[PDB]
Amino acid sequence: LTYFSARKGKRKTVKAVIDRFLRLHCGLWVRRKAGYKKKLWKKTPARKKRLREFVFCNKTQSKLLDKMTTSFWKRRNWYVDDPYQKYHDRTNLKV
Amino acid sequence: ANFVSWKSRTKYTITPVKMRKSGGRDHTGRIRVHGIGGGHKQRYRMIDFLRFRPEETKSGPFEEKVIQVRYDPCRSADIALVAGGSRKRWIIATENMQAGDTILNSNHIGRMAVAAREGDAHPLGALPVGTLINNVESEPGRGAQYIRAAGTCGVLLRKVNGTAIIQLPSKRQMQVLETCVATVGRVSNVDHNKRVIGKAGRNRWLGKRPNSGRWHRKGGWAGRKIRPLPPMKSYVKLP
Amino acid sequence: LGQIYANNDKLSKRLKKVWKPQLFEREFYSEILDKKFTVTVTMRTLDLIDEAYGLDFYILKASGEDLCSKFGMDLKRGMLLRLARQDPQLHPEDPERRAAIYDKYKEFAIPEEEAEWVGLTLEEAIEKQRLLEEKDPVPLFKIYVAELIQQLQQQALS
Amino acid sequence: KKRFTPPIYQPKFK
RNA sequence: CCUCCGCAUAAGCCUGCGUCAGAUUAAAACACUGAACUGACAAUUAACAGCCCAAUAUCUACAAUCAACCAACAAGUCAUUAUUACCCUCACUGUCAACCCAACACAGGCAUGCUCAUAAGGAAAGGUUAAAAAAAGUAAAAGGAACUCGGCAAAUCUUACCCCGCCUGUUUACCAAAAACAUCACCUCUAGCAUCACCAGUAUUAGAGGCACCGCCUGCCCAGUGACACAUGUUUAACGGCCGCGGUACCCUAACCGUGCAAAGGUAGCAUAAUCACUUGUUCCUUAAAUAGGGACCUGUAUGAAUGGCUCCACGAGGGUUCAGCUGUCUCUUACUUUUAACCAGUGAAAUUGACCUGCCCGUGAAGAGGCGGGCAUAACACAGCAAGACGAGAAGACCCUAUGGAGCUUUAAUUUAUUAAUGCAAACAGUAUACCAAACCUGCAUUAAAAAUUUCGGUUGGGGCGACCUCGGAGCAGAACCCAACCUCCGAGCAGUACAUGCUAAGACUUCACCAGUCAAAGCGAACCUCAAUUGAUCCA
RNA sequence: GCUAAACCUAGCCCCAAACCCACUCCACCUUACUACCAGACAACCUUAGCCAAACCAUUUACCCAAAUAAAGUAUAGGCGAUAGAAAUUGAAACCUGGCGCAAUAGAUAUAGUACCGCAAGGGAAAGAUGAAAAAUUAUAACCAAGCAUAAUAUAGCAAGGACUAACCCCUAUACCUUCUGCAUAAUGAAUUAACUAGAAAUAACUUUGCAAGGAGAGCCAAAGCUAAGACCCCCGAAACCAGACGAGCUACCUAAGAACAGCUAAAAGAGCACACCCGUCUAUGUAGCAAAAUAGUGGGAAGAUUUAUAGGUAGAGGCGACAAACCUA
Ligand SMILES: [Mg+2]
Ligand SMILES: [Mg+2]
Ligand SMILES: [Mg+2]
Ligand SMILES: [Mg+2]
Ligand SMILES: [Mg+2]
Ligand SMILES: [Mg+2]
Ligand SMILES: [Mg+2]
Ligand SMILES: [Mg+2]
Ligand SMILES: [Mg+2]
Ligand SMILES: [Mg+2]
Ligand SMILES: [Mg+2]
Ligand SMILES: [Mg+2]
Ligand SMILES: [Mg+2]
Ligand SMILES: [Mg+2]
Ligand SMILES: [Mg+2]
Ligand SMILES: [Mg+2]
Ligand SMILES: [Mg+2]
Ligand SMILES: [Mg+2]
Ligand SMILES: [Mg+2]
Ligand SMILES: [Mg+2]
Ligand SMILES: [Mg+2]
Ligand SMILES: [Mg+2]
Ligand SMILES: [Mg+2]
Ligand SMILES: [Mg+2]
Ligand SMILES: [Mg+2]
Ligand SMILES: [Mg+2]
Ligand SMILES: [Mg+2]
Ligand SMILES: [Mg+2]
Ligand SMILES: [Mg+2]
Ligand SMILES: [Mg+2]
Ligand SMILES: [Mg+2]
Ligand SMILES: [Mg+2]
Ligand SMILES: [Mg+2]
Ligand SMILES: [Mg+2]
Ligand SMILES: [Mg+2]
Ligand SMILES: [Mg+2]
Ligand SMILES: [Mg+2]
Ligand SMILES: [Mg+2]
Ligand SMILES: [Mg+2]
Ligand SMILES: [Mg+2]
Ligand SMILES: [Mg+2]
Ligand SMILES: [Mg+2]
Ligand SMILES: [Mg+2]
Ligand SMILES: [Mg+2]
Ligand SMILES: [Mg+2]
Ligand SMILES: [Mg+2]
Ligand SMILES: [Mg+2]
Ligand SMILES: [Mg+2]
Ligand SMILES: [Mg+2]
């Protein structure tokens, strides 16, 4: 991911991670199950509904996605009409 | 690569000029034609291939006289210096040409056919149908280029109105203008295909290296081609 | 001298292709110089000449960054010198034609001291400046006798 | 093939 | 005593065995003092070969080889004329040597003349003794190749037979010098022709290819490739190919017929051969004894007619055998001389070295112990010879295997024609009664035969290729929660017989030992009141 | 105590400032280090390649306009390993050193010297007494690897336990590593002296400071922000391109020359055989005379033979009587 560039000497990110995932401010990444739009005629409606759900990642996957990004993608955005605004902060956490 | 040609003589003379061998070397120096190199030293003779040519302050026909028949190593046939007037020029010898012969170099085309011998030269417009000719030209006042080897000869076929079709030794027809001067008869030094080489020493003396020793697989061009006769090529310019 | 892909796609082979313009050996006629020249002209040049209404206008209006040729700059400099020096172009016995030619090309008229340095390269300019600033070294005897006569006049008139 | 290495001569100062 | 040497010319740094002092130290493989030196002294003087030629036009076909007979073929190494202007003259480079190229004072190499041994030039030996071993020389009672795979040094002087190649020659400089490449004879294809080789040539020529003389001959084919005509064809001395079965009277080896295919179903010749294993073939000879050699046979199912088949005139440092005569290779070795060997005088290595106070047997260990266990063995130190061991010295093995590390060759493995010749289109010129003709030279698009700009060649394989497999489920190994492999032994699956509420949300769990994936379901709105075991496909893009 | 150990100066690297130079006379474009004579032709051109994506065919900062935040954002990319701006607030003239070194360090340098090839090119150590060397004095010695002074004395990985004394008595299988297992007969080593091998981001841990704000503009924030400390090796291949060099050995060609006694000479790309061209075999050595030699047995030696001189054909090639043979061991 180029830890040191040749012009600015900073850290670069992977645009695939940004285009395929979505990081929340709490420290979770929202992904999408693969194969949710291809070959839907041989799958049961239960599987079709399960594939169309925002599934969270794990620990090592979240750590990898954080290491592949810089400090810009780990901030807090205040959009006007953000459907994921209620998922930024995570309450009722006891270790 | 300082490669300069030995053809540095813009004036016709009689003394044999020394020639330099090449061995397949052009101006760059790389071998481009294989099979040439290493031979006996030879001297070049300035051979005048143009038969009819007027002298200084001359225009009409002139007589000649064969002196002595020699040999030319630069070609297969032999040459013979023929004197006449106040100059001597080398011309190609013909069959049955010895010392003390008399030949004519005319140009006035006649109404009827002239029954010339096999030594003199006359334009194709005065020669009978079916005559063994040699050293035929292509353009009026250009020079003899076709049929110049040893024993090669051509036979007149037909006449139209201003052309003359000449049968080439390759059984191919070729027409030319009527005002072209061509010799009559066959070239001397016959029986050349019977020259048994006997040993590679003769080929090394002539200046021919042996062929390549690589085994080349014959492609599709090694088969016999039974092809018809190509059409007659015309040199007469028509507007 | 650029590069062209195979079937107009970047997922193939990158080949190199060099385009060449078309050359038509034509013949023109300059009215300012009154002499015909054989120039292997192309098509865009002919179009620009037709749009500029003649060859002299196309040469005098286009700047140095448009001709991209030394002959064009030489022709421009020659026309400028001919229009500035007012030298007889054709010949006497008919000055009306020369007057009309000079009046047709009157929207420029570059002075003589500036038209001689139009189109020249750096080496040619240096050579011209050296030839103008040549001047054989004057003997010091003249300067010495001048200083001497000046000093004697200054000491005598006082 | 015919493998062979050429010897190396030292400078004439030692 | 040798002279297989030397003197000059040619090439080559130019002072490199003349004197003087130092010669204490420093280079002689040791010394004197000097071909492996420090400083000073000056050699070589040209007549030797060079340093060269005032122009304008023109002239130069009857070789050399004692050149006089003769005789040729590879057709050849030497010459002037008319005119104009020019009467100043001897300058320059080296003349030494014991010498050059190979790291050297190297048993290597160097072109021509001179007497081919002389009038040039040098010393195989430092001394002491005669150890073993090795190398170079003379011969030997009897056998003369009986030893060795093979006549392998050697001296006598040596005949015949077979294969291969026509011959001379040349090729792997530095392990193969050959049957290997070439050579005249033959055959195939291409080209109607003027300036830079081809060629200052003309279809008895030139270029591109296959075998390689003389004697007998080259029988067939365009279904497949290429080439030529675009007339569906021609080409094979162009790439290549010329059957099987059944019936066949006593025995292999058949006359003949039927059947299916196709261009023909092996022609001539020759041989168990340089010729797949059977093959040490029948048999004769050469020896008393012969897979060695010659002669007549093809089931040669894999010889074969220019990938040419066989004898023949001559020949081969090519590969094999033998006859009359002889060489210690042997039975069975020996007599002498030199190099060399042992000691004395000095210069004086290279490979190699973890340290050694370093014996043997049995047994054990990373599987072959002088260093481990039990025994045997033992005052110490040098010289002179052999190899049994220390898996001894030289090359990170050239043989086997791995590598998403390379390179060479050939394509009908992949991107493409970047450069030609042919094409069709568009612009560029000019005539032409609503039509045709598109010449020479530039530009862009797409195609065809040669070059090419780049690349890779998957995995397990009781070492690798060949044998077998590449995804998933079930039965025993794994027996009663769960998981567990094998190139352990078996069934299978890449789907189906019928309604689309096979609609939308939403607590809780299992999870093929991780992840990506898959499955069950509380309840509500909506509606009348799902079967089988594996049964399959993600990112990008469209 | 012999061999041999230390003695600091030519200076060496980067900053700030400053823009730095080029004939005493002769010779220097032909055989440079040459005084003197008749065709004037000579440049104007996408660089490529390695590596990476575990291959590789698209792609891979290097492009010569001062900082930073934006921002590694939109974008380009077999949409993947990677590459990467712009719009925008902005960027305080002048001061002479080394928390670098001292000959195996620092430029290779006292020097681009010797040496290697025809050639481009490669290319290394040097110098230590002293105020008075016009003080040739008497001292300053003492430490590593090699030696004598002063050899060995039976037994054993060289060591330990020990006693009045070295041995004698008992125990005990060198060092690091790929390896389950190594002193194993696997790898490395003769010693001494000098030199040589863990360089760093997002995210983490600890400690000061401030605080709903922290921070010397930009950034973050539902207890946060700033600063400091802490951390990620060396050497070793075959391959490819670009710019220049070679036919003086060897392959081929070109111009002018030279060489071959004697006998049989059948007329001859005939035979034996001198000098000469090449080397089929035996024996000698493989750190030799020699990084390819020594005698004969060898083939040719009137021609497809050898050789002195000069020139040309060079790597995406030259040449080739085709050995993938040769192109300076
Ligand atoms: Mg031929
Ligand atoms: Mg051949
Ligand atoms: Mg002399
Ligand atoms: Mg040597
Ligand atoms: Mg003498
Ligand atoms: Mg002696
Ligand atoms: Mg001796
Ligand atoms: Mg005897
Ligand atoms: Mg025997
Ligand atoms: Mg013998
Ligand atoms: Mg032969
Ligand atoms: Mg050899
Ligand atoms: Mg040779
Ligand atoms: Mg040999
Ligand atoms: Mg042959
Ligand atoms: Mg045939
Ligand atoms: Mg057989
Ligand atoms: Mg025998
Ligand atoms: Mg021979
Ligand atoms: Mg001694
Ligand atoms: Mg052990
Ligand atoms: Mg044992
Ligand atoms: Mg041992
Ligand atoms: Mg190895
Ligand atoms: Mg692999
Ligand atoms: Mg690879
Ligand atoms: Mg590669
Ligand atoms: Mg390559
Ligand atoms: Mg494998
Ligand atoms: Mg196996
Ligand atoms: Mg699980
Ligand atoms: Mg329900
Ligand atoms: Mg890579
Ligand atoms: Mg900007
Ligand atoms: Mg230094
Ligand atoms: Mg240095
Ligand atoms: Mg010591
Ligand atoms: Mg003991
Ligand atoms: Mg260590
Ligand atoms: Mg290892
Ligand atoms: Mg092992
Ligand atoms: Mg060991
Ligand atoms: Mg090993
Ligand atoms: Mg060792
Ligand atoms: Mg040469
Ligand atoms: Mg040759
Ligand atoms: Mg002969
Ligand atoms: Mg002979
Ligand atoms: Mg071959």
Residue numbers in the entry:
A (entry chain 3): 94 to 188
B (entry chain D): 61 to 299
C (entry chain X): 87 to 244
D (entry chain d): 38 to 51
The authors write:
We have determined near-atomic-resolution cryo-EM structures of the human 55S mitoribosome in complex with the human EF-G1mt to investigate the roles of the mito-specific MRPs and C-terminal extension in EF-G1mt in tRNAmt translocation in mammalian mitochondria. To obtain the 55S·EF-G1mt complex a non-hydrolysable analog of GTP, GMPPCP, was used to lock EF-G1mt on the mitoribosomes.
In all three 55S·EF-G1mt complexes, the EF-G1mt is held in position by interacting with several components of both the large and small mitoribosomal subunits but domain IV of EF-G1mt and mitoribosomal components interact differently among these complexes. Minimum mitoribosomal interactions with domain IV occur in Class I complex, an intermediate number of interactions occur in Class II complex, and the maximum interactions occur in Class III complex. The tip of EF-G1mt domain IV in the Class I complex is positioned ~10 Å away from 12S rRNA helices h24 and h30, closer to the 28S shoulder or the A site than its position in the Class III complex.
